[PDB]
């Protein structure tokens, strides 16, 4: 599928934290930068993702906020 | 303020689409990647928000999908 | 792509409302059930949705309440 | 109450999956399609959802997407 | 309807900006707080919402951060 | 940090329910006002919230509804 979500950044695996409905899947995005996401764990499993697997962060505009120091 | 969202991410402002009650701030986080948000004029105003400034991208982890290539079987 | 949200309905696009940096799409999903998305007028563009375009209505589960009468 | 969001999607829980602090219920809406909702535990209690509760899926629609085939 | 998101904070509407298509509604919920709500104008216009209208500001628990002082 | 979220209401936590890999804050507000926020436990634990802390319930304008009788 190709998605509306304005923001679908590729990366690796680096970690996944598994709960009792969801779970946090941490990518490396490049960069130095990180994402977590928490989804079901449903679809971490119907996705396969394990640590290493090649995946993609996405996240619809109306989610992200902007910060200033 | 400390936030607990778990996605924080530096950036540079590299555009700012103005609308007429939000408007969309792309930013430049590194390593080839640009995050869009779309929020309130309002807040755009009051964060001082210009090309070139430099800011964060707040992201909730609980609104963040994975996805995977469409070839991957599982 | 192939994506985590556990809402992935097909459906027909029957009307779109454009806004200034948003729109309006709303996709009629069968039986009577009709789902509206309010997302960036560039994703509008960038899937090429007219009316009676097929295309899916993405959710997030935790995107998702439930209601009783 | 009458609510602003945009989808207010009747059917059926077919589903209930317990959690820690939430859990997905699954609703069948008609038309072979289902929702599931990633909720508390507290709501879906005080809700009293059970396995053939009629209840709604509610979604605001800034929190819908639109994807296609990209063939 | 009731709803399961956990927040359902009342208060009466002091301003709505209209936009394209979304507005903004400010309501006053008293201990001069204020939520703002960016929701779409068919739904400002179906719920008759104009400034002084008793409303309710409906927040689902999962969109809820926490932040402190540093 | 300074955020774009228009919403920002100070208040003190009553209430904590650890999950697996998120928990439940509930935060008195003021004038008879609860808010709940379902984040991670990670994050619950970072912020070093406890019954008693101050802290501030942080919520972007698009996640508010608008309901009436
Ligand atoms: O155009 Mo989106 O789906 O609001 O990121
Ligand atoms: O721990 Mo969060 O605030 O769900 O990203
Ligand atoms: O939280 Mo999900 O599993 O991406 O719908
Ligand atoms: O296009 Mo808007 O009405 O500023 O969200
Ligand atoms: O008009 Mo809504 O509450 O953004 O679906
Ligand atoms: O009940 Mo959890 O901690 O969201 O899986
Ligand atoms: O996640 Mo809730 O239990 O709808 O606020
Ligand atoms: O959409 Mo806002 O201006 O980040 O609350």
């Known amino acids: 599928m190709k998605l509306s979500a304005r923001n679908q950044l590729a990366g690796k695996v680096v970690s996944i934290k598994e709960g009792a409905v969801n779970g946090i899947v941490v990518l490396d995005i490049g960069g130095g930068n990180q994402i ?3 989804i079901s764990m449903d679809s971490i499993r119907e996705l396969g993702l394990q640590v290493g697997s090649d995946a993609y962060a996405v996240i619809k505009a109306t989610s992200v906020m902007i910060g200033i120091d």
Do not use: E, G, I, L
């Open 36 to 38: 977590s996401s928490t």
